[PDB]
Amino acid sequence: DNDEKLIIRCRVVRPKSLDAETEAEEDHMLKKIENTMLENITLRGVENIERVVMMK
C-alpha cells in the first residue's frame, strides 16, 4: 500500500511439455485471461448486487 503506484505483475508458467504451436497465440492467450480476470472475478460480495448505499 505504501507504494506510490499499486501494480500487479502476473506470469503464466508453462508445463514441462513444450508447445510450439502456442507461441503464436501466447500473447493472444494473455489477453483472453486478462479479459476473464477483469470480468468474472469476485473479489467479495453477492452476485447481482450492483451498488449499496447506507441510509439512516
Binding site: 504451436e21 503464436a24 497465440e25 493472444h28
Partner: protein, 51 residues
C-alpha cells in the same frame, strides 16, 4: 506474397478452427503449397537448365 484461393479462404473463414494461426502463411510456404508465379517459373526454368 503467395495469396490463397477462394475455396481455401472460405474453408478457413468457416469454423474450421477458432481463428486462423498467426503464421499460417509461413507454415504453408514450407509445405510447398501456395507458391507464387515468380517461384513457380524459376523452379521450372531451373528444372530445364539442370539438363
Amino acid at each position: 506474397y503467395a495469396t490463397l484461393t477462394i475455396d481455401e479462404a472460405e474453408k478457413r473463414m468457416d469454423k474450421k478452427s477458432g481463428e486462423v494461426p498467426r503464421w499460417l502463411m509461413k507454415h504453408l510456404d514450407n509445405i510447398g503449397t501456395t507458391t507464387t508465379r515468380y517461384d513457380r517459373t524459376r523452379r521450372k526454368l531451373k528444372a530445364v537448365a539442370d539438363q
